[PDB]
Amino acid sequence: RFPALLAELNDLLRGELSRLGVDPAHSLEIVVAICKHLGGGQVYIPRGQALDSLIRDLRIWNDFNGRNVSELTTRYGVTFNTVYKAIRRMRRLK
DNA sequence: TTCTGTAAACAGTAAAGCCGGTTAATCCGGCTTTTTTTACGTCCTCAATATAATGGGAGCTGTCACGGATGCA
């Protein structure tokens, strides 16, 4: 499982470096670096699901300024309970 | 020279934080009866009449013929 996934990861890293102006071969260093600092065991790579919901609520209350909460339920289709919890959360943070 | 293990490493089982929807729960404004109270017109109830008035039958019923009582005279 490791070889093909590592190869694709290196391909994407070098593509992103080329897009950003960095030399693609520098990606090897990057992956080597992460291969030193990310080991320890077996765990699947996902995303920031907590951060995904965090930025979702961020966008929700950035678009929210009143009645457009209904538009929020029309934006993607979500509950008013989570929207109200997110509003209270944005009130909590300063 | 031939037959054994062992550490790097990839499948597995279990559990819970979160989570993208799941349900119940209360509060502001409004229409619709639901009942109630007057207004009133209508409906219901009663009283009085001062010339004089003084006894029906109302259509009978149109007809058969047994028996068995029945109560008198």
From Swiss-Prot:
It comes from the Viruses. Residues 2-38 are annotated as: Dimerization. Keywords: Activator, DNA-binding, Early protein, Host cytoplasm, Transcription, Transcription regulation. Residues 51-94 are annotated as: DNA-binding. Residues 68-88 bind DNA. Induction: This protein is constitively expressed from the Pgem promoter unlike most other early proteins which are expressed under the control of the Pe promoter. Its expression seems to escape repression by repressor protein c and thus could occur throughout latency. One of its GO terms (cellular component) is host cell cytoplasm. The keyword Chaperone does not apply. One of its GO terms (molecular function) is DNA binding. The keyword Transcription applies. It is found in: Host cytoplasm. Changing residue 44 to G/I/R/S/V: Complete loss of DNA-binding and transcription activation ability. Homodimer. Activator of the Pm promoter, which controls middle genes expression. Activation of Pm allows expression of protein C necessary for late gene expression. In addition to Mor binding, activation of Pm might require the interaction of Mor with the C-terminus of host RNAP subunits RpoA and RpoH. Belongs to the c/mor transcriptional regulatory family. The dimerization domain in the N-terminus and the DNA-binding domain in the C-terminus are connected by a linker containing a beta-strand. This is Middle operon regulator. The lineage of its organism: Viruses, Duplodnaviria, Heunggongvirae, Uroviricota, Caudoviricetes. The chain holds residues 27 to 120 of 129 of the full protein.
